[PDB]
Amino acid sequence: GSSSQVQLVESGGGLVQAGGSLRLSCAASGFPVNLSYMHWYRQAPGKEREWVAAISSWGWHTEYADSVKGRFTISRDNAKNTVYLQMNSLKPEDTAVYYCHVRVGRSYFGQGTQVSVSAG
Amino acid sequence: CNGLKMFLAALSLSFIAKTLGAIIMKSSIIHIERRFEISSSLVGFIDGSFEIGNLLVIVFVSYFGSKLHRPKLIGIGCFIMGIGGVLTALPHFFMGYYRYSTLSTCLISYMWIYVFMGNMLRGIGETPIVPLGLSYIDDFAKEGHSSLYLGILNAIAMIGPIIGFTLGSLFSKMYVDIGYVDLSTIRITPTDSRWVGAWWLNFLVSGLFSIISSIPFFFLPQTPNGFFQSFKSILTNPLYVMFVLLTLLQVSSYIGAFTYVFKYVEQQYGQPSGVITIPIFASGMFLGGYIIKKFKLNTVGIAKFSCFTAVMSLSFYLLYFFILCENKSVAGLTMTYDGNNPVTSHRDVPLSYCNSDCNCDESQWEPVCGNNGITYISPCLAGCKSSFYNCSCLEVAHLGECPRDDACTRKFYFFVAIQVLNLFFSALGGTSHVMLIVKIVQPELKSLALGFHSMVIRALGGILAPIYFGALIDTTCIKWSTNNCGTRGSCRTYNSTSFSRVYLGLSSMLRVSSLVLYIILIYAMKKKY
């Protein structure tokens, strides 16, 4: 594994209106994240890093927050080395910057994309 | 150092490493159960993985490694238990951050496999240390020097538990996410029910210590200067089979006692559950080996020495039936709730008129101590209406059970004196098992006889003996506690004379049977030799 560190890139952030849907993808480059749990965090305006979701190494066991339970859907695809977060029936309280997190050796965070949600 | 002393030091370091790893695995298991959110059955499976790994390979490793490069295989085993120690701590490194989030007055998910296999790898790790190491020691040592070396090994192996409990208490106070989070943001204390310490640090220290102890074995020379036929020749030897059954009974009594010494102390003398004990055990082990070496005992002499130490141990053990303090007076368990009439039994006792309202729970156990010296089950059953003041059933109250009289606190001090003397005498004959079981069997079967016996001791005396000791202990329980899921829970109070009679009697007759086997085996070796 001739690599330096794991860089996580997010995509799929964008404006949504009412109880809509979205899908955030996190791609990993560097050390293999195939053994490691990859998590989804959020940052509310004026609040710290709330924990949203988690996935296992092979997608066998998923941990979800009690803030969004049954509305969100985390998923993993290890062939393309990506995790996804499907979000359905959104609320304006979900308006946050969503980060992707892995801990292959060292704790590694994403840049975060605006998932601003309109109210209506 | 002339070759064998280097091996003796390296095997001493491996003894420290394996006892340290055992103490670490015992101590960090609460934090492991909290962090991985696994149940009691699963964490018991992870605990028993060491037995599963060890027992299935110990006999074959002991047989086949006696003809190969023995220090190389001991180094391979130390490397293997080091890799297991690293692999146990590897779940922490790539799982992510850890996340955690009654007055009773009278009213009128799959990461544990990396632990599991890792612990199982530790089961394969400790495997070549006792048979191959002790066969290598006593094959090449001077005539009579091997007992002294084994006593030194068993004495210096006690450094391992000291490091184990020291580092467990050191790394339990640290947070599990040390070096990853800002520690001012962490609000919970080590006294909190959601606290998880740095359990991974324990396994990393044990794993790298085992890898360091694996290093000097690859620089040691091989010499300082069929399976079924051999197993049949081992099992048809009557002296060997009688010795294995004999030591199985003795070590079964040892383990079944030592598992519940603290529970017996808690129930009989009321005291809460190795500061001075560890030097006593180390001095006893070294002195037993030194007695064997200096007095130049033969096989019959070593047998008589071990027999005399265990006769003296049971002779001191038999005083435990005379220092029994009286039974606890608990309202609603040994008498009625008012304390005026004794009950026939503890099964579904009637309620009293002092608490006939009874907006309480009988299953709830919060013991309170009255002014008359009688403990009550709960303050709600005690008739206390305010907090405790105005208790109705005290009429013919602090939190906690009543401390007992000084009359049997003196008996408790006698008891811990006899425990100190008993552990000294039991450690005084520790070397004699290995010395006898080498000298009984054929010289090219020294390792296998040390392997299979190590299979019998850890299986039928290590696993089964706490199980049947606890089975006979739990039949003396008075107040049973109902679990949240309604399954098999735990016990709170025991009938103290009944529990004492079962515990000391089972240990005593399990020692008496071993003494009978001693007398028969002494007669057998006197006839044969």
Curated annotation (Swiss-Prot), chain B:
Classification via Gene3D superfamilies: 3.30.60.30, MFS general substrate transporter like domains
Residue spans crossing the bilayer: 6-25, 45-65, 72-96, 110-138, 158-178, 197-221, 234-255, 274-292, 297-320, 416-438, 448-473, 508-525
Superkingdom assignment: Eukaryota
Molecular function in Gene Ontology: bile acid transmembrane transporter activity; organic anion transmembrane transporter activity; prostaglandin transmembrane transporter activity; sodium-independent organic anion transmembrane transporter activity; thyroid hormone transmembrane transporter activity
Protein known as: Solute carrier organic anion transporter family member 1B1
Entry similarity comment: Belongs to the organo anion transporter (TC 2.A.60) family.
InterPro entries: Kazal_dom, Kazal_dom_sf, MFS_dom, MFS_trans_sf, OATP
The reaction(s) this protein catalyses: taurocholate(out) = taurocholate(in); dehydroepiandrosterone 3-sulfate(out) = dehydroepiandrosterone 3-sulfate(in); estrone 3-sulfate(out) = estrone 3-sulfate(in); 3,3',5'-triiodo-L-thyronine(out) = 3,3',5'-triiodo-L-thyronine(in)
Organism name: Homo sapiens (Human)
Extracellular side: 26-44, 179-196, 256-273, 321-415, 474-507
Disease: Hyperbilirubinemia, Rotor type: An autosomal recessive form of primary conjugated hyperbilirubinemia. Affected individuals develop mild jaundice not associated with hemolysis shortly after birth or in childhood. They have delayed plasma clearance of the unconjugated anionic dye bromsulphthalein and prominent urinary excretion of coproporphyrin I. Hepatic pigmentation is normal.
Chain coiled-coil ranges: none
Tissue expression: Highly expressed in liver, at the basolateral membranes of centrilobular hepatocytes. Expressed in liver (at protein level). Expressed in fetal liver. Not detected in heart, brain, placenta, lung, skeletal muscle, kidney, pancreas, spleen, thymus, prostate, testis, ovary, small intestine, colon and leukocyte. In testis, primarily localized to the basal membrane of Sertoli cells and weakly expressed in Leydig cells and within the tubules.
UniProt-annotated location(s): Basolateral cell membrane; Basal cell membrane
Disulfide bonds: C354-C384, C360-C380, C369-C393
Biological process, per Gene Ontology: bile acid and bile salt transport; heme catabolic process; monoatomic ion transport; organic anion transport; sodium-independent organic anion transport; xenobiotic metabolic process
Swiss-Prot/TrEMBL keywords: Cell membrane, Disulfide bond, Glycoprotein, Ion transport, Lipid transport, Membrane, Phosphoprotein, Transmembrane, Transmembrane helix, Transport
Residue stretches making up the Kazal-like domain: 348-395
All ranges on the Cytoplasmic side of the membrane: 66-71, 139-157, 293-296, 439-447
Keyword Transmembrane: yes
Domains: entry comment: A conserved histidine residue in the third TMD (His-92) may play an essential role in the pH sensitivity of SLCO1B1/OATP1B1-mediated substrate transport.
The protein's role, per its UniProt record: Mediates the Na(+)-independent uptake of organic anions. Shows broad substrate specificity, can transport both organic anions such as bile acid taurocholate (cholyltaurine) and conjugated steroids (dehydroepiandrosterone 3-sulfate, 17-beta-glucuronosyl estradiol, and estrone 3-sulfate), as well as eicosanoids (prostaglandin E2, thromboxane B2, leukotriene C4, and leukotriene E4), and thyroid hormones (T4/L-thyroxine, and T3/3,3',5'-triiodo-L-thyronine). Can take up bilirubin glucuronides from plasma into the liver, contributing to the detoxification-enhancing liver-blood shuttling loop.
